[PDB]
Design an enzyme around this catalytic site. Structure first.
Site, PDB file in Angstrom:
ATOM      1  NE  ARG A   1       8.112 -59.370-101.599  1.00 29.07           N
ATOM      2  CZ  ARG A   1       7.198 -59.826-102.460  1.00 29.07           C
ATOM      3  NH1 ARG A   1       6.205 -60.635-102.085  1.00 29.07           N
ATOM      4  NH2 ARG A   1       7.268 -59.437-103.731  1.00 29.07           N
TER       5      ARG A   1
ATOM      6  CG  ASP B   1      12.205 -55.582-114.145  1.00 28.25           C
ATOM      7  OD1 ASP B   1      11.705 -56.502-114.831  1.00 28.25           O
ATOM      8  OD2 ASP B   1      11.489 -54.651-113.718  1.00 28.25           O
TER       9      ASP B   1
ATOM     10  CE1 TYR C   1      11.348 -51.862-109.880  1.00 32.15           C
ATOM     11  CE2 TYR C   1      10.571 -52.047-112.105  1.00 32.15           C
ATOM     12  CZ  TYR C   1      11.147 -52.610-111.007  1.00 32.15           C
ATOM     13  OH  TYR C   1      11.523 -53.920-111.052  1.00 32.15           O
TER      14      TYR C   1
END
Ligand SMILES: NC(=O)c1ccc[n+]([C@@H]2O[C@H](COP(=O)([O-])OP(=O)(O)OC[C@H]3O[C@@H](n4cnc5c(N)ncnc54)[C@H](OP(=O)(O)O)[C@@H]3O)[C@@H](O)[C@H]2O)c1
Ligand SMILES: NC(=O)c1ccc[n+]([C@@H]2O[C@H](COP(=O)([O-])OP(=O)(O)OC[C@H]3O[C@@H](n4cnc5c(N)ncnc54)[C@H](OP(=O)(O)O)[C@@H]3O)[C@@H](O)[C@H]2O)c1
Ligand SMILES: NC(=O)c1ccc[n+]([C@@H]2O[C@H](COP(=O)([O-])OP(=O)(O)OC[C@H]3O[C@@H](n4cnc5c(N)ncnc54)[C@H](OP(=O)(O)O)[C@@H]3O)[C@@H](O)[C@H]2O)c1
Ligand SMILES: NC(=O)c1ccc[n+]([C@@H]2O[C@H](COP(=O)([O-])OP(=O)(O)OC[C@H]3O[C@@H](n4cnc5c(N)ncnc54)[C@H](OP(=O)(O)O)[C@@H]3O)[C@@H](O)[C@H]2O)c1
Ligand SMILES: Nc1nc(N)c2c(-c3ccccc3)c(-c3ccc(Br)cc3)[nH]c2n1
Ligand SMILES: Nc1nc(N)c2c(-c3ccccc3)c(-c3ccc(Br)cc3)[nH]c2n1
Ligand SMILES: Nc1nc(N)c2c(-c3ccccc3)c(-c3ccc(Br)cc3)[nH]c2n1
Ligand SMILES: Nc1nc(N)c2c(-c3ccccc3)c(-c3ccc(Br)cc3)[nH]c2n1
Lengths: 251, 251, 249, 251
Positions: free
Chosen positions: D13, D144, D157
Site C-alpha cells: 500500500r 492525517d 487512533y
C-alpha cells in the site's frame, strides 16, 4: 460609575442579544445600526425603560471607503459622548452573501462590503478604541468557526473572516501593553438567515452534533459576556468556538 | 507546446527566483512588476537570451481601487496575448510596512496597498485566471509562516496574509471541480529587506533553528515549483511552510 | 441535589484552585491525588468544614500500565459512591519533565508523560461516559502546544493527544449531551522553586502584564465551560495565556 | 555512495509505494513489516533485481511495551548493518480500528497498539535515528489531514495521529542543530481497504473536491520524495496535506 459598550449591527439577531445581555450585566451601550433604524431604537427604548439614559443608538455604513475611518471614529466618539468612556467594543456587523469566482453589485462593492464590514471596519474601530485610552477594557470580534471549512462560493466573505482572526491576534499583541484585551467568538450555525427556506435551515441544523439545532443568539452572547467579564482578565488572543461541534465533523 | 505562468512582483528577490525556476523547468513567463521596471526588463532579457520569445514584462499597481479588477484581468490577458495560455499563477507581489494601531500615508491608502496587494489582487487575479479557461492548472499564493505569531504593529499586513490563507482555501474548494489546484507557500524569514542594516538582519537569522539563517530565494522557489509540478497532482489547499522551524520557536 | 466533579491532581496549584472554585459554585468534589496525600486531605477538610459531606479524596497513579483502565474506572466509581453522581470530570493531573531525543527508563518516561497527559484522560472519559443536567468534561491542555519547550517531546506528544481526545470525545459524546472542552494555560503559577532569573525569563515574555496566570484565572475558564453559559460549546479549547502564544521568537 | 532509508509498514500500500520511490530515487531501503512477510520479501526481491544489495527487510511489532525502545533501536541498527548509514526514516506503520467510548481486544491492548504504532514507535525510532547520527538527513511522519475532523469512534487512533503532529514539531526543533529535518505528510483519503464494499468506497471518493477520488499511494509517496529531496532543505516542522481538498469540505 457604569462601564460602556459599543456593539456594531446591534439592532437584531446576534448583535441585539449581545447588547441586551451587556445591558442586563450592568453596561451602558451604544447600539450601532446601518439600515435597521426602527429596531435599533425600539431596543434603545426597551433598555432605557429598564434604566434611564443607558442606551443610545448610532448609525453608520461600515462598507470600506475614504470616509470609513471618520465613520468608525464617530462610532467610538458616540460612546465617549453619551457616557463619558468606552470600556468594551463588539464587532458584530457583517455582510454575508455569495461571491462566486466564476460566472457561467459589482465585484468591488462586494470587496468593499464584505471586506469592510468583516475586517477593515473592525480594524479602524480598533484603532479608534485604542487611541482614546482598575479598568477592564476588552474587544470582542464575531468570528466564524467554519473559517477553515468555508461555504462554496463565499471566498470574499471568508477572506474577511480570516483577516478578522488576523486582526484579533495582531491587536491582542499590540494592545496588551495598554490592558486592552482582544478576543473573539465564533458561531458556527446560529440564527439562520431570514430568507433561507425552512428546508434549508433544517439541512444545516441536522449537521450539528450537539442537539441537531442552531445556537440561540443568547448562547453567542454568553461567550461574549464571559470574555468581557473579570473572569477573563488573563485571556487575550483567544477565539472561543460556540458551534455545538459543527467544526469537528468531516464531510 | 510550452506552458505559461504569471508571477506577480517578479522583478526581483523571491518573485524573480520563482520566475527563473519556472523558466528553467520550461515555462514561458509573465514578469509582473510595479515600480521596478529596470530589474524586470533586465530579467526578461536574460530569460529570452536563454530561450527566445519566452518572457514578457507586464506593469500594474496592485493597490486596491475600483479599477484593480480590470488591472488583474489584464495581467491574465497579457499572458494569453504573449503565449496563448495561462497554466500557473503565482501571487507573490506584496506590500509590507508597519501600521500601528496607536500613534505619511493615509490609513485608507495603507488599507488599499496592504489588503489589496496581499489579498484582494490575488482574489481578482484568481477569478480572472479561472474565468479565462493535457493541462495542469494551479495557483500558488505566497503566504507567511508567522501569520499566527505576527510582527508588532503589522496588523493590516497580517490581516492581508490571513485573508490570503482564506482565499487559498476557499478557492481550492471552489475551483477543484475545474482541475485548478490552489496552494500556498509560506516563507518565514527569507531575503531580508534591501535596507535593513546587517546587525538587525542577524537578530532575525539567529532565531531560525535550521541553520540560524534565512531561506535563500531559491529555497522558496523550490516549494513553489514542487506544488506546480505533476508530483503534486492531488495537493490542493495546502500551505507549505518553508521557515526552517521558526514558527515552532516560542518567545 | 448538588452536582459532583472529579478533578485529577487537585491537591495543589491549578488543580486545587479548580476543585475550590467548583466547590464555591455548589459542586461536591472528588479530589484526586497521587503523592500529595497530606495536602489532599487538608483540602477536603477545608471544603467539608465549609459544607459538610461535599469533598472526598481519591488516590491513584495515572501512569500508563495495564491497570490504568481499572484505576480510572475506580476514580469515577469513587465519585458515584461518595456522591450518587458525576456531572463533571476535569483532567488536570500531568507529568512534566524533559525527555531529550539525545533518572528513569524511556519506557517509564513514555508511560508517565503519555499516561498522565493523554491516556488517563481517555480512560477517565470512557468510564465517565459509560456510567451515565449539565454534564461535561474539561481537559487542561497547553497554549504552547504548537510552539513547545526544547526537549519536552513526550510531554508535548501527550498534550497534542489531549487536543485530539477533546475533539474526538466532543464529537462522540454529543448525542449523550456530554460536552467536552479544554482550557489551555500559557505560563501559569510559577513555582518558588525556579530562579528569579528563570522566573523573570518566562514573565518577560507574556504580553499582558508581563506575568504568569494565577491558579484562579485558569480555574475561571474551567468553571465558565461547565456552567450553563457554555451549553452550546463542545469541542472548544480556550487559551488563557496573556498573549504568549502570539509572540514570535 | 548511496543514501539509505527505513520505511515502516513498507510491505503494502502506501509504505511500499514510498519504499519503491525512495529506491527508484537511489536510496538503499530497509523494508520494515509486522505480519506481511510474504509481500515484504517479494518487494525486497523486486527491488534487488533492479539493483543488487539495495533492499533488506526487518520484522517488528510496533505496539507499545517494555521492549519497544529496544525493538525500535534494532530497526535502525538494521539499516546501519545493512547499508553503513541511515539517511531517511519514514514512520508509516499504523494500526487503525475503532475504539468507541461507549458500550475483541482489551482496551489496554488497543492503547498499546494505536498509540504505539502511531506515536510512541515513531518517537523511539526518532531517538535512535538521532542517537546514531550525532548531508541530507530527514525524518518524514505519515500524518492525517482529517486529524481535527476525526472519524466517529476513532479516539485512540486520533490521539495517536495528534501526538504524531506533536512529535514532528518537537523533533524538528530539537534535531534542527544536528542538521536533521523532520516533516510530515497528511493523507486524507487514500487507498481504501481492499475488502471495503465499492459502494462504501464511493461514499468517500465523492467527498473529495479534487477529482472525486482517493489519492493513489504514489501521490502520497511523491510528497515524501519531495520532503527528503535537496529541494526541501530549509523545510522542517512542515506537514503537507495530500487530500484533494477533503480537509476543506464542511459537513
Ligand atoms: N448567523 C450565524 O449563524 C453566524 C455564523 C458564523 C459567524 N457569524 C458571525 O456572527 C456575527 C453575527 O451574525 P448575524 O447573523 O447576527 O449577522 P447578520 O444578521 O448578517 O448581520 C448583522 C448586522 O450587520 C449589519 N451590517 C450588515 N452590513 C452592513 C454595512 N455595510 N454597514 C454596517 N452594518 C452592516 C446589519 O445592520 P442593519 O440591519 O442595522 O443594516 C446587520 O443587522 C457576524 O459577524 C457573523 O458573521 C454568524
Ligand atoms: N521576504 C521574506 O522573508 C518573506 C517572509 C514572509 C512571506 N514572504 C512572502 O513572499 C513573497 C515575496 O517576498 P519578498 O520579500 O520578495 O517581497 P518584497 O520584495 O517585499 O515584495 C515583492 C514585490 O511585490 C511588489 N509590490 C509591492 N507593492 C505593490 C503594489 N502596490 N502593486 C504591485 N506590486 C507591488 C513589488 O514590486 P516592484 O519592486 O516592481 O514595485 C515588490 O518588488 C511576498 O508575498 C512575501 O510576503 C516573504
Ligand atoms: N502550569 C503551567 O504553566 C501550565 C502550562 C500549560 C498547561 N498546563 C496544564 O494545566 C494543568 C495544571 O498544571 P499544573 O502546573 O498545576 O500541574 P503540576 O503541579 O505540574 O501537576 C499537577 C498534579 O498532577 C499530578 N501528577 C503528576 N504525575 C502523576 C501521575 N503519574 N499519576 C497521577 N498524578 C500525577 C500531581 O499530583 P500529586 O502532587 O498528588 O502527586 C500534581 O500535583 C496540567 O495539565 C498542566 O500541564 C499548565
Ligand atoms: N489510507 C488512508 O486513507 C490514510 C488516511 C490518512 C492517513 N493515512 C496514514 O498513511 C499511512 C499509510 O496508510 P496505509 O492505509 O497504507 O496503512 P495501512 O495499510 O492501514 O497500514 C500500514 C501498515 O502498518 C503496519 N502495522 C499495523 N499494525 C502494526 C504493528 N502493531 N506493528 C508494526 N506495524 C504495524 C502493517 O504492516 P503488516 O501488514 O506488515 O502487518 C500495515 O501493512 C498510515 O500511517 C496512515 O495512518 C492513511
Ligand atoms: N453575518 C453573517 N450572517 C450569517 N447569517 C452567517 C452565516 C450562516 C449562513 C447560513 C446558515 C447559517 C449561518 C455564516 C456561516 C459561515 C460559514 C458556514 Br460553513 C456557514 C454559515 N456566516 C454568517 N455571517
Ligand atoms: N512582502 C514582504 N516582504 C518582507 N521583506 C517581509 C517580511 C520580513 C521582513 C523583515 C524580516 C523578516 C521578514 C515579512 C515577515 C513576516 C512575518 C514576520 Br513575524 C516578520 C516579517 N513579510 C514580508 N513580506
Ligand atoms: N503539568 C505541567 N506543569 C508545569 N509546571 C508546566 C509548565 C510550566 C513550565 C515552566 C514554568 C511554569 C510552568 C508548562 C509549560 C508548557 C509549555 C511551555 Br512553552 C512552557 C511551560 N506545562 C506544564 N505542565
Ligand atoms: N493506518 C491507516 N489505514 C487506513 N486505511 C486509514 C484510513 C482510512 C480508512 C478507510 C477509508 C479511508 C481512510 C484513515 C482515515 C483517516 C481519517 C478519516 Br476522517 C478516516 C479514515 N486512517 C487510516 N490509517
Amino acid at each position: 460609575e457604569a462601564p460602556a459598550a459599543v456593539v456594531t449591527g446591534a439592532a437584531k439577531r446576534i448583535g441585539r442579544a449581545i447588547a441586551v445581555k451587556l445591558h442586563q450585566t450592568g453596561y451602558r451601550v451604544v447600539i450601532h445600526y446601518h439600515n435597521s433604524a426602527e429596531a435599533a431604537v425600539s431596543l434603545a427604548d426597551e433598555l432605557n425603560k429598564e434604566r434611564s439614559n443607558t442606551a443610545v443608538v448610532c448609525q453608520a455604513d461600515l462598507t470600506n471607503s475614504n470616509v470609513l475611518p471618520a465613520s468608525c471614529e464617530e462610532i467610538i466618539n458616540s460612546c465617549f459622548r453619551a457616557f463619558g468612556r468606552c470600556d468594551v467594543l463588539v464587532n458584530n456587523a457583517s455582510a454575508f452573501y455569495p461571491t462566486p469566482l466564476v460566472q457561467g453589485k459589482t465585484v468591488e462593492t462586494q470587496v468593499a462590503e464584505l471586506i469592510g464590514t468583516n475586517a477593515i471596519a473592525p480594524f479602524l474601530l480598533t484603532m479608534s478604541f485604542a487611541q482614546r485610552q482598575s479598568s477592564n477594557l476588552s474587544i470582542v470580534n464575531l468570528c466564524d468557526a467554519m473559517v477553515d471549512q468555508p461555504c462554496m462560493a463565499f471566498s470574499l466573505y471568508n477572506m474577511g473572516k480570516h483577516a478578522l482572526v488576523g486582526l484579533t491576534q495582531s491587536a491582542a499583541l499590540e494592545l496588551a501593553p495598554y490592558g486592552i484585551r482582544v478576543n473573539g467568538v465564533a458561531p458556527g450555525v446560529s440564527l439562520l438567515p431570514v430568507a433561507m427556506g425552512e428546508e434549508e435551515k433544517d439541512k444545516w441544523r441536522r449537521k450539528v452534533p450537539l442537539g441537531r439545532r442552531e445556537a440561540s443568539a443568547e448562547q453567542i452572547a454568553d461567550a461574549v459576556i464571559f470574555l468581557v467579564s473579570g473572569s477573563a482578565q488573563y485571556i487575550t488572543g483567544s477565539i472561543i468556538k460556540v458551534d455545538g461541534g459543527l467544526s469537528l465533523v468531516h464531510a
